[PDB]
Amino acid sequence: VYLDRKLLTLEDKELGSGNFGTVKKGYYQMKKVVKTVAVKILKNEANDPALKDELLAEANVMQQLDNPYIVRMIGICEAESWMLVMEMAELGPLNKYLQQNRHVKDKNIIELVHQVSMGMKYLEESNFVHRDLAARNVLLVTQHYAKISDFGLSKALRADENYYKAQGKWPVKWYAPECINYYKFSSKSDVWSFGVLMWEAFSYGQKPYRGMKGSEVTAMLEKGERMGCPAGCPREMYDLMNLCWTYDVENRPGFAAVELRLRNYYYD
Numbered sequence: 258v259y260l261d262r263k264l265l266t267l268e269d270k271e272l273g274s275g276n277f278g279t280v281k282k283g284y285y286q287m288k289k290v291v292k293t294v295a296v297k298i299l300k301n302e303a304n305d306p307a308l309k310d311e312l313l314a315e316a317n318v319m320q321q322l323d324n325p326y327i328v329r330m331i332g333i334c335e336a337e338s339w340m341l342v343m344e345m346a347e348l349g350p351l352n353k354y355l356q357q358n359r360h361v362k363d364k365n366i367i368e369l370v371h372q373v374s375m376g377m378k379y380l381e382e383s384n385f386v387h388r389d390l391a392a393r394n395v396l397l398v399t400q401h402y403a404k405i406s407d408f409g410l411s412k413a414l415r416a417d418e419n420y421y422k423a424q425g426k427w428p429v430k431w432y433a434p435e436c437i438n439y440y441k442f443s444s445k446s447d448v449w450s451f452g453v454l455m456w457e458a459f460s461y462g463q464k465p466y467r468g469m470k471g472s473e474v475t476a477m478l479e480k481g482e483r484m485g486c487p488a489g490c491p492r493e494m495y496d497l498m499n500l501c502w503t504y505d506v507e508n509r510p511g512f513a514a515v516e517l518r519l520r521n522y523y524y525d
């Protein structure tokens with residue numbers, strides 16, 4: 258889906274920056290209406306071929322996903338840099354939002370992380386692994402509606418395997434022991450990451466494993482230690498984080514079980 262650069266207007270003041278380049282706000286003219294978009298634009302004109310490949314692969318993943326809790330891609334634009342154009346989630350990354358809005362109620366945090374678990378249950382059912390599931394990569398449409406983005410490390414699993422095996426530069430603080438030790442990424446690896454994301458959410462966007470190097474995090478986890486309970490965090494939510502942080506992959510829940518535990522309404 259290649260878009261017409263002429264139908265896109267970009268604002269100069271970026272929404273965000275990352276090691277890869279910038280995210281800009283824009284407006285894309287559809288058949289009748291304009292749609293507000295967030296646009297990922299690669300740094301230094303997309304001359305870095307690995308960056309460009311990563312974008313195209315990110316676009317290829319997003320194009321295949323259709324779920325209310327996953328950001329929708331409109332398409333890619335090759336103009337002055339390469340650009341991935343996405344429907345805009347106007348409240349921005351969850352971590353920043355919670356840093357700035359410290360009176361969001363527990364029930365509301367549970368609601369948001371339940372939405373993330375519904376999107377991840379969909380990804381699991383679709384046999385994709387996200388591999389970068391962090392609060393910074395959850396976008397708020399409204400204070401009561403979260404979506405997942407940032408599919409740059411995501412992989413479609415082979416039909417005969419339950420994991421992706423890497424031959425990286427990685428968000429180690431969100432990774433399960435099997436990712437670190439064996440380079441194996443399953444949906445259950447994403448569940449571990451989700452436990453970190455829950456910790457972040459109930460800590461109003463604090464960084465996990467503050468002050469620690471990745472080697473120190475690995476050592477801490479191998480010793481059976483885990484981050485402590487955020488001040489004020491509901492006990493049941495901390496208990497669910499510890500279940501997501503089950504060392505043994507076979508006994509760690511999948512997203513179908515996690516999603517059930519985050520439903521705040523009666524069900525079977």
Ligand SMILES: Cc1cc(C)cc(Nc2nccc(-c3cc(C(=O)N[C@H]4CCCC[C@H]4N)n(C)n3)n2)c1
Nearest residue numbers: 272273274275295343344345346348349393406407
């Ligand atoms: C107010 C505000 C700020 C920002 C930054 C984004 C938005 N909305 C928005 N809506 C849909 C999608 C995205 C988005 C951001 C990134 C990304 O690449 N983000 C990276 C750089 C920015 C901060 C976090 C990081 N993962 N992707 C791959 N999709 N964003 C709104």
